[PDB]
């Protein structure tokens, strides 16, 4: 379940704000994504995040 994986910033240096599902808190939180090599628990909006991972 990719929804249970920790957020992945990646090797690139950008400071792009994305969302990830935090199974412990039961909600989607923001994190800094570097711009490349994104894993699946990485969404552009809280809505996309909740629709895909909400309640996992």
């Amino acid at each position: 379940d990719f929804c249970l994986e920790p957020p992945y910033t990646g090797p690139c240096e950008a400071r792009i704000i994305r969302y990830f599902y935090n199974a412990k808190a039961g909600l989607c939180q923001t994190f800094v994504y570097g711009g490349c090599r994104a894993k699946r628990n990485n969404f552009k909006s809280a809505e996309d995040c909740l629709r895909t991972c909400g309640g996992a």
């Binding site: 090797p11 690139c12 240096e13 950008a14 400071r15 704000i17 800094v32 711009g35 090599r37």
Partner: protein, 221 residues
């Protein structure tokens, strides 16, 4: 920029901030209407901010201009990060605190270095984004040491710069920013393994290999 120093208001006139409601990447002004940055900084709705020092407060020397076009290198590979370069056309020309940086005539050799600048994170372990522009002088490293640091990940279009001891490096928020050597734009902040880690120098897009692509692309768009 980890281990750097405050550049000083508008002392790096070609440095720009890419904004999408917040600073997410840097870039370099190479023409009154064109900016060079990293391909992985591609985003819709980009506003380019020129003449910036403190990115959080309006000081009066700024020019906020929307991008009209964003051209990512046709051979950019999001997996290997090869050809990580992009051109952004400004909706209107900037009024040249603000100045363009020259493209290189030749590639720089190991030992040269260069000035790296940006508003990225300043802590190796932790998070701390600055208000003002930070600067760093780091030398270009040899291809062999770069390849030893990142086995099978370095292409001919990338070069390492920094210190093997660690402590001085580019970091998150610096991507797309300039690596200027001898008044010429030699690199674009691209990637690395963590920030300012020992034996893991920063990796940059080798600009000297794209000069003809840049000139022709600017001219036909």
């Amino acid at each position: 920029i980890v281990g750097g120093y405050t550049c000083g208001a508008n002392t790096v006139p070609y440095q720009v901030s890419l904004n999408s409601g917040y600073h997410f990447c840097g870039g370099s002004l190479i023409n009154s209407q064109w900016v060079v940055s990293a391909a992985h900084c591609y985003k819709s709705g980009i506003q380019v901010r020129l003449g910036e020092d403190n990115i959080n407060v309006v000081e009066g020397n700024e020019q906020f201009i929307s991008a009209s076009k964003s051209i990512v290198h046709p051979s950019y590979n999001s997996n290997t990060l090869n050809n990580d370069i992009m051109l952004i056309k400004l909706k209107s020309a900037a009024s040249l605190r603000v100045a363009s940086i020259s493209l290189p005539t030749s590639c720089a050799s190991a030992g040269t270095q260069c000035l790296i600048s940006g508003w990225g994170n300043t802590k190796s372990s932790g998070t701390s984004y600055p208000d003002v522009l930070k600067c760093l002088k780091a030398p270009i490293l040899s291809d062999s040491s770069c390849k030893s640091a990142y086995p099978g990940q370095i292409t001919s279009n990338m070069f390492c710069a920094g210190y093997l001891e660690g402590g001085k490096d580019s970091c998150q928020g610096d991507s797309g920013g300039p690596v200027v050597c001898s008044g010429k734009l030699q690199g674009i902040v691209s990637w690395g393994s963590g920030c300012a880690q020992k034996n893991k120098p920063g990796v940059y897009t080798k600009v000297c290999n794209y000069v003809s692509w840049i000139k022709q692309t600017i001219a036909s768009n």
